[PDB]
């Protein structure tokens, strides 16, 4: 089920990803593009080293960091992130995939991730 290529989106209005899983290949290059499909939201992507623990300190550096992108200033616990995009706007990240594990995907929209939108990016061996 691992895919280098990855496609993945705002679920309409919700506080949600249309995926809340996928599977990557580790140590290869990994392609993801994220279509804010929503109508007056601003959503990103941000794929953190870890899990839950990882995904809440950097979703609180995140709100902390502020607007316009909401990322902390450097990238120590995030293994890719696109910019905060607007509704209909869209964008492709390349990043290495990291050490087989799982990794927790959000959006750093301020209350977006306790809103539920998040999953995990499982790596393979
Ligand atoms: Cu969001």
Redesign the pocket.
Same mark, same amino acid.
């Given at each position: 089920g691992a895919s280098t290529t990855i496609e993945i989106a705002?679920d309409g209005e919700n506080?949600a990803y249309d995926k809340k899983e996928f599977t990557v290949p580790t140590g290869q290059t990994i392609t993801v593009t994220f279509k #804010?499909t929503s109508t007056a939201?601003? %959503? #990103?992507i941000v794929i953190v080293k870890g899990g839950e623990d990882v995904a809440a300190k950097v979703d609180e550096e995140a709100i902390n960091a502020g607007p316009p992108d909401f990322l902390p200033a450097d990238r120590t616990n995030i293994i890719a992130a696109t910019k905060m995009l607007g509704p209909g706007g869209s964008e492709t990240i390349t990043f290495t995939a990291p050490a087989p594990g799982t990794y927790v995907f959000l959006?750093?929209?301020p209350a %977006?991730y306790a809103?539920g939108?998040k999953g995990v990016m499982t790596v393979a061996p």
């Amino acid at each position: 089920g691992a895919s280098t290529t990855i496609e993945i989106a705002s679920d309409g209005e919700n506080l949600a990803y249309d995926k809340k899983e996928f599977t990557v290949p580790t140590g290869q290059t990994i392609t993801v593009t994220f279509k #804010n499909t929503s109508t007056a939201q601003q %959503h #990103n992507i941000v794929i953190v080293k870890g899990g839950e623990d990882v995904a809440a300190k950097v979703d609180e550096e995140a709100i902390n960091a502020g607007p316009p992108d909401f990322l902390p200033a450097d990238r120590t616990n995030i293994i890719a992130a696109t910019k905060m995009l607007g509704p209909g706007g869209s964008e492709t990240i390349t990043f290495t995939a990291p050490a087989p594990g799982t990794y927790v995907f959000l959006c750093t929209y301020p209350a %977006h991730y306790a809103g539920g939108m998040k999953g995990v990016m499982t790596v393979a061996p």
